[PDB]
Amino acid sequence: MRVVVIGAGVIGLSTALCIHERYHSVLQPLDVKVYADRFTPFTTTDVAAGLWQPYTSEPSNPQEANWNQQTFNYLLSHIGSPNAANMGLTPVSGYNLFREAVPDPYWKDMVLGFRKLTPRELDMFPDYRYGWFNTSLILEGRKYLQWLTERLTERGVKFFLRKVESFEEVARGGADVIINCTGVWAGVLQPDPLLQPGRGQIIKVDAPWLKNFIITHDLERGIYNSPYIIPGLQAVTLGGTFQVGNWNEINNIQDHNTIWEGCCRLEPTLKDAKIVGEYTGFRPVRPQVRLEREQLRFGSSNTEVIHNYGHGGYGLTIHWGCALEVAKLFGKVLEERNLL
Amino acid sequence: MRVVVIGAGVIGLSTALCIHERYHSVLQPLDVKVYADRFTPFTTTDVAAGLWQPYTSEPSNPQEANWNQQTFNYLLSHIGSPNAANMGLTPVSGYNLFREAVPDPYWKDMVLGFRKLTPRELDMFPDYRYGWFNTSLILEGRKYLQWLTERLTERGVKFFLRKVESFEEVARGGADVIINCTGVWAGVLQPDPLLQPGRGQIIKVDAPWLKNFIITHDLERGIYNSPYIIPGLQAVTLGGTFQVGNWNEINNIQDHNTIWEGCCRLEPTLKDAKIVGEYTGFRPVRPQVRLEREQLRFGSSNTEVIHNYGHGGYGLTIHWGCALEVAKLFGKVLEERNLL
Numbered sequence: 001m002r003v004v005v006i007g008a009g010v011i012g013l014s015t016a017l018c019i020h021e022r023y024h025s026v027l028q029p030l031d032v033k034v035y036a037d038r039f040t041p042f043t044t045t046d047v048a049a050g051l052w053q054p055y056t057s058e059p060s061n062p063q064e065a066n067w068n069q070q071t072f073n074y075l076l077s078h079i080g081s082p083n084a085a086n087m088g089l090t091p092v093s094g095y096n097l098f099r100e101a102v103p104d105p106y107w108k109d110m111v112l113g114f115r116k117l118t119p120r121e122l123d124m125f126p127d128y129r130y131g132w133f134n135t136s137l138i139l140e141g142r143k144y145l146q147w148l149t150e151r152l153t154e155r156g157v158k159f160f161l162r163k164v165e166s167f168e169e170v171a172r173g174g175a176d177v178i179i180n181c182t183g184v185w186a187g188v189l190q191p192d193p194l195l196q197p198g199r200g201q202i203i204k205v206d207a208p209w210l211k212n213f214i215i216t217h218d219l220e221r222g223i224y225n226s227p228y229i230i231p232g233l234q235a236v237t238l239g240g241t242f243q244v245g246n247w248n249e250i251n252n253i254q255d256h257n258t259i260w261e262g263c264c265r266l267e268p269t270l271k272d273a274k275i276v277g278e279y280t281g282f283r284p285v286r287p288q289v290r291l292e293r294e295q296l297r298f299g300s301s302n303t304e305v306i307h308n309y310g311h312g313g314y315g316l317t318i319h320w321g322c323a324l325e326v327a328k329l330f331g332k333v334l335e336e337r338n339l340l
Numbered sequence: 341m342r343v344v345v346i347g348a349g350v351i352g353l354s355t356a357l358c359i360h361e362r363y364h365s366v367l368q369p370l371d372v373k374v375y376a377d378r379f380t381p382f383t384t385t386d387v388a389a390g391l392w393q394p395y396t397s398e399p400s401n402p403q404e405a406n407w408n409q410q411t412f413n414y415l416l417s418h419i420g421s422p423n424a425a426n427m428g429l430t431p432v433s434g435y436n437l438f439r440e441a442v443p444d445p446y447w448k449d450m451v452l453g454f455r456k457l458t459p460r461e462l463d464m465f466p467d468y469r470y471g472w473f474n475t476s477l478i479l480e481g482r483k484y485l486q487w488l489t490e491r492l493t494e495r496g497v498k499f500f501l502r503k504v505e506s507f508e509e510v511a512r513g514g515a516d517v518i519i520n521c522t523g524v525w526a527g528v529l530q531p532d533p534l535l536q537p538g539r540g541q542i543i544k545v546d547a548p549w550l551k552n553f554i555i556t557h558d559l560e561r562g563i564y565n566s567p568y569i570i571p572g573l574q575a576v577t578l579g580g581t582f583q584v585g586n587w588n589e590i591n592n593i594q595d596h597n598t599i600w601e602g603c604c605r606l607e608p609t610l611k612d613a614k615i616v617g618e619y620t621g622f623r624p625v626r627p628q629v630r631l632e633r634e635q636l637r638f639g640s641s642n643t644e645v646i647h648n649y650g651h652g653g654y655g656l657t658i659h660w661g662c663a664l665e666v667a668k669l670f671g672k673v674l675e676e677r678n679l680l
């Protein structure tokens with residue numbers, strides 16, 4: 001079987017791994033190749049704050065809730081083991097701050113020990129009068145991608161640096177099944193007017209004393225268009241922009257001041273922090289995650305394509321649920337071919 | 341008035357500043373000198389793990405409960421301000437794990453968001469079936485000491501490296517009021533059978549990925565004779581020895597092994613951690629905190645002596661409530677001798 005994954009971000013590699021584990025023993029040659037024009041440090045995943053937290057609003061597709069759940073559990077199960085940190089995994093507690101009372105998120109029972117903030121805790125955040133506290137996990141994009149790559153590589157997965165112009169060429173290449181995990185750039189392979197970029201900029205700072213994550217929410221400006229501080233494995237992410245439709249790939253000084261200025265007010269001690277880097281990435285926004293099979297004929301070429309992209313700003317959070325769903329779909333592909 | 345404070349640890353310096361802040365505006369010449377033979381990096385306070393957490397056991401002297409409270413509130417008020425991290429302060433959340441069910445601590449309502457761990461949270465710690473989770477504060481001893489010193493220095497307080505062989509010499513030295521904050525060595529200046537050292541050894545390792553504190557409790561071996569992981573500002577403290585009656589100042593190999601092994605079992609990721617330093621210190625173990633006024637005549641001298649020592653393993657945790665008490669006792673002196 002020749003499977004070609006197009007994409008080397010969290011979604012692409014998780015899907016590749018999940019498949020190899022799942023069918024390597026039943027399928028004779030399970031040729032798995034990864035095609036991508038951007039690898040590790042250059043993918044959107046590397047710009048991710050690295051926190052597990054779905055949107056505060058219910059998913060359009062309920063199945064996405066299950067996928068989020070499955071991902072937390074999968075990751076939680078790696079906590080009590082060495083190498084957990086090596087794969088970019090670590091527990092972290094934090095605050096979700098609001099200027100007004102809001103309803104509980106559907107994911108309240110998924111995270112560890114969720115509760116509302118007491119007035120004495122809210123005294124530490126004088127600009128907010130409502131909030132939640134909870135424990136969750138940090139899944140550092142880059143570290144995780146390096147890990148996956150290590151696991152994929154030793155699994156016999158070959159990686160190829162190349163921009164696919166069309167599924168057709170991959171199909172002509174001999175790919176029996178193509179897993180499309182191209183993120184925000186999916187519309188290029190196939191027009192998808194529902195897929196649009198959610199430009200986000202972040203500042204990575206060196207402020208080790210910061211132990212808890214702090215996410216402020218502005219219901220007026222929309223999700224993530226508010227300052228947040230997310231401590232990672234060894235640097236803190238300062239952020240605050242979510243601009244849908246914007247394709248500007250360059251760091252905007254406009255945003256730099258909003259983020260920095262917004263974060264230092266939240267955390268005055270940030271004044272002593274040292275800036276390590278400024279990044280911009282496009283969250284693959286879509287009303288629903290596109291995860292489905294699609295047949296392509298080409299006359300005696302009938303290639304199978306399984307899509308899995310458009311995970312907006314919850315790609316690290318839902319990654320395993322989607323990967324498992326793709327493996328399940330890949331299973332049907334084999335059953336159609338009587339491959340078991 | 342000439343006040344001589346003996347001791348440069350958290351207790352000494354805290355008392356010095358509190359007295360100075362309070363009376364420097366009303367006392368005519370307020371001469372405050374701090375005598376000490378061991379300064380900052382070499383005091384027990386620098387070896388301290390840096391967590392604010394009283395004993396799980398009820399307080400002997402009911403008043404210590406209140407001092408612990410006063411201190412937490414004093415520290416908490418620095419949270420929302422810059423320099424909080426410069427004085428060694430930073431919020432931290434963590435677990436207190438038990439092998440058996442235990443009543444809540446008297447301080448359950450002093451810390452932020454106290455609650456018991458859930459079975460699913462306990463699945464992260466297979467060796468224990470009970471525990472609490474709560475948010476407390478980190479007060480890096482060394483940093484706090486440097487901070488206090490700077491404040492005291494710009495306040496006009498003078499520091500002298502000297503070993504006070506007795507109170508008398510100091511009294512004869514022209515000391516109207518002597519604040520005795522000699523910690524575990526107070527027995528030398530005045531025999532105290534109730535004061536015994538609770539030697540403790542710790543290992544400071546570099547493991548930035550650890551954001552939460554984990555403290556294990558084994559009732560059979562007594563307080564702090566069980567593995568604990570306390571993340572500091574920019575290093576983690578591993579520990580677990582509370583040896584009363586032990587006067588050994590050098591690092592024990594067996595103790596190194598008790599800490600390292602036990603901590604790696606609790607937290608497996610500790611394997612990638614680079615050991616930064618190994619230290620031993622003596623908690624001033626005493627059934628009660630000695631904090632009282634004592635009159636030493638010496639024939640015509642009649643020097644006031646206020647003791648403030650025997651804070652066991654909660655010196656950082658109680659420091660402020662005590663300094664405020666000393667400052668109160670000091671006020672009385674002023675009124676008696678009619679200086680105010």
Ligand SMILES: Cc1cc2nc3c(=O)[nH]c(=O)nc-3n(C[C@@H](O)[C@H](O)[C@@H](O)COP(=O)(O)OP(=O)(O)OC[C@H]3O[C@@H](n4cnc5c(N)ncnc54)[C@H](O)[C@@H]3O)c2cc1C
Pocket residue numbers: 006007008009010011012035036037038039043044045046047048049050051052053162163164165181182183184185186188189199200201202239280281282283284309310311312313314315316317318
């Ligand atoms: C500021 C910011 C913060 C965020 N923080 C979080 C967070 O803390 N939590 C969370 O869950 N989510 C977060 N995200 C969301 C985000 O990380 C996404 O969900 C993203 O990681 C989804 O992964 P992906 O594999 O779909 O995309 P990507 O990482 O972008 O990978 C896409 C891959 O496809 C390849 N590719 C594309 N087109 C082609 C082509 N034509 N030919 C060959 N190769 C191609 C690319 O090279 C790349 O390898 C954040 C995003 C941003 C930008």
Ligand SMILES: Cc1cc2nc3c(=O)[nH]c(=O)nc-3n(C[C@@H](O)[C@H](O)[C@@H](O)COP(=O)(O)OP(=O)(O)OC[C@H]3O[C@@H](n4cnc5c(N)ncnc54)[C@H](O)[C@@H]3O)c2cc1C
Pocket residue numbers: 346347348349350351352375376377378379383384385386387388389390391392393502503504505521522523524525526528529539540541542579620621622623624648649650651652653654655656657658
């Ligand atoms: C491993 C360990 C972990 C601990 N962790 C915590 C923790 O996380 N939380 C917490 O609340 N506390 C902790 N402690 C408790 C501990 O730090 C004490 O409570 C301590 O700081 C009390 O402070 P002190 O000022 O009395 O003594 P010290 O800080 O030791 O200072 C005593 C001072 O007296 C001086 N002195 C003594 N005799 C003379 C003399 N005759 N002449 C001149 N000067 C003299 C000494 O030189 C020194 O300057 C821990 C202790 C240890 C060892």
Ligand SMILES: Nc1ccccc1C(=O)O
Pocket residue numbers: 049051052053200215224228230239283313314
């Ligand atoms: N997905 C996230 C989770 C937490 C904080 C920020 C983000 C973000 O989209 O930038």
Ligand SMILES: Nc1ccccc1C(=O)O
Pocket residue numbers: 389391392393540555564568570579653654
């Ligand atoms: N007082 C403490 C608080 C937390 C961890 C250790 C200690 C200790 O005394 O060693």
